[PDB]
Amino acid sequence: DASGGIILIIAAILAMIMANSGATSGWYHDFLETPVQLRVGSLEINKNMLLWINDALMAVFFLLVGLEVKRELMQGSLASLRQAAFPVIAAIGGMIVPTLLYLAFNYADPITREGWAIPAATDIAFALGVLALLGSRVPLALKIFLMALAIIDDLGAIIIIALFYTNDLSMASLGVAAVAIAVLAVLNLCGARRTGVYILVGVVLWTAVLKSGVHATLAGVIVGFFIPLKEKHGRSPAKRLEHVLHPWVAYLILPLFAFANAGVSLGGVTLDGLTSILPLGIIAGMLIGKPLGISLFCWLALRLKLAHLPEGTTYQQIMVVGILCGIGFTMSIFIASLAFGSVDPELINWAKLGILVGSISSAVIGYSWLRV
Amino acid sequence: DASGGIILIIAAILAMIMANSGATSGWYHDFLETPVQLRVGSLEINKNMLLWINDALMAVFFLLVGLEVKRELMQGSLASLRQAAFPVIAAIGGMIVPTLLYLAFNYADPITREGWAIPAATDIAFALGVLALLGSRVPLALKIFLMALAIIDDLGAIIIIALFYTNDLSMASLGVAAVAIAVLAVLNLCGARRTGVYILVGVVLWTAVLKSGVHATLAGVIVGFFIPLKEKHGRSPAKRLEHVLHPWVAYLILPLFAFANAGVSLGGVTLDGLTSILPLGIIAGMLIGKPLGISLFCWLALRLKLAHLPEGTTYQQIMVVGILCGIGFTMSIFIASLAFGSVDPELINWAKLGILVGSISSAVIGYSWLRV
């Protein structure tokens, strides 16, 4: 609702300018990479501080996203076999065309082919903030469709990334991870009505698989999928937790995150995007693949029978929302960092540059085509 | 005021039987001596896990105690206009005689002289539960007097321990701690009704002085002091925080601490506390010094018009309330652990044995003299 994306923009530009002209030598290059090591007897964990920061922030953000999914799936839309045909078809369209277009001239080289899921990610706060500047010319249908599409897109991308092409972590880590989940199910079955116990068990589970990557992020979604929501005695823990967490994410979680990962050297940029395989695949994937991979499949779903277009919404609004949906920004940057770990910084820097250029271009094109 | 205390008793007996059992000491002893090292390339922190557990639990408990102190100082029993002379004089009495008796035998010996404040500490939850066991006709005045006396005694002992006979921290730690406090003062002065900001700044402060346990405990008290309480718009953050925190402290933190720090070994114990100087001094201070000192100084308080006895006391119940107040248990065990760190386990084991014996004897005597 409120235009809270200006804080994200100011944080991004502050991070971009901090890394140049006098700074970035004492800090921001020796910093954000100092190794940290935690040792308990034989057990030992070594990682960079940026990894810890990203893990914590994304764990919180995906806990919120899982809570939103649980609230939305049983109340409002997504409550029937036909009430969710349109967003599901839109997500299916957005999970095929941009990825297929990205891999057209990239899949030849494996080290860049591994990042096939970069353009499929979609941002949340930026698109809603962009919508916020329009005065009363924002139907509720557009907002509900946008969020219920981007959320499922991100969840599917994260699930697919976690399932395949993942390291085989220690069996002892999963031995205690397969018990906390069952403990969570037993606790929820008999009723708890206390978010503290659930949060404690979630912290235990998150620490269990902290040695891995995406699994730490997925722990938040798993935990948010289990907190009870059924209305009783005038109170509901899920709604209270959502209301409590909402201001923090838009002001402290998403900010201070774009301040860390975002920001490129921008010192030896030549040939614009270098016209290489990965920046071009990222730029074309989010600028053409998403607005075209969503509109066409939605049109197919808009056929006789199958899905029906929402009330107070025509194809033109669908196509502009599809244009806006081609924005990854922070989420796409995080996906790129996760997929390109233990890699020389040149690839990550080029991917971030391409993501920034594509997001800016898509946002300006979309805001240009809202009749004003 | 629920009964409680049974959880603490069962945790203590479980820890004792685990430690002294035939085939579980081999794991109980080794689990608490596992080193933990954290580093960021500099300022390495190496400590035993027991120290971390004690620091966290005591920080939370003392945050609650500081919140209670702030609540009761301006609108509670303490009130103003020096009308709360009785609890202050009682605390002054409890901070002199019990310490004097302890130091009588340990004056010459230098190594055991450090723990002069062992019997001054007073347990709150156990005494309150013992009182509530007979909660059929006991007046509220006795309960509030006991709680205020124990709280002020513990705070005075902890402050004196922190200020005097302490190590000196680094310049950077003190410099950081001198900015967070000023930040908290500015936040409170300018108005801030969100407890999340205060908790975050308190976490930063606690991490700043994490090197020394005493200052880590002091951080919680300071944070509880600085959180706003003034009534506005039919709500108060301090009261809500106290209500939220109350079930957790009496059900999770205290029993866990009791289970962690009550595992003494009953192997080769001869002549009770060997008729030594340290256990005998602890017993004399906790059993004889506390009630005699409390009663005597209360008598002098009444004598010279310094204070008037509260309603429904008649000085008959003051002796039994002092006997009940002569119970250290968890608090005295923690104080002994803090004072006797990096010392041979024999000394701390003997101190724990003496503390437990004195606490049990005082509790049974107090329950016997309450006329069943």
Author numbering:
A (entry chain A), B (entry chain B): 11 to 382
What does the paper say about this structure?
Na+/H+ exchangers facilitate the exchange of monovalent cations (Na+/Li+/K+) and protons (H+) across membranes to regulate intracellular pH, sodium levels and cell volume. Na+/H+ exchangers that perform this task are physiological homodimers, and whilst the ion transporting domain is highly conserved, their dimerization differs. The transporter is made up of two distinct domains, a dimerization domain and an ion-transporting (core) domain. Here, we report cryo-EM structures of E. coli NhaA and E. caballus NHE9 in complex with cardiolipin and phosphatidylinositol-3,5-bisphosphate PI(3,5)P2 lipids binding at their respective dimer interfaces.
Following sample preparation optimization, a data set of 14,329 movies was collected and a cryo-EM map at 3.3 Å resolution was calculated, according to the gold-standard Fourier shell correlation (FSC) 0.143 criterion. Similar to previous NhaA crystal structures, the cryo-EM structure of NhaA adopts the inward-facing conformation. As such, the mutation of charged residues on the cytoplasmic surface can alter the pH of NhaA activation and mutation of surface histidine residues to alanine abolished activity altogether. Similar to the monomeric crystal structure at pH 6.520, an intracellular cavity in the cryo-EM structure at pH 7.5 has opened to enable Na+ accessibility to the ion-binding site. One CDL lipid (CDL 1) was located in the middle of the positively-charged part of the dimerization interface, flanked by two additional CDL lipids (CDL 2) bound at the ends of the dimer interface. Although this part of the dimerization interface is very positively-charged with four arginine side chains per protomer contributing — R203, R204, R245 and R250 — only the symmetry-related R204 residues directly interacts with the phosphate headgroups of the central CDL 1 lipid. The flanking CDL 2 lipids form hydrogen bonds to R204 and resides in a hydrophobic pocket lined by residues W258, Y261, and L262 from one protomer and L197, V207, and L210 from the other protomer. Here we could structurally confirm that CDL binds between the NhaA protomers and it is there stabilised by interactions with arginine residues. The structure of NhaA in complex with CDL supports the proposed regulatory switch induced by salt-stress in E. coli.
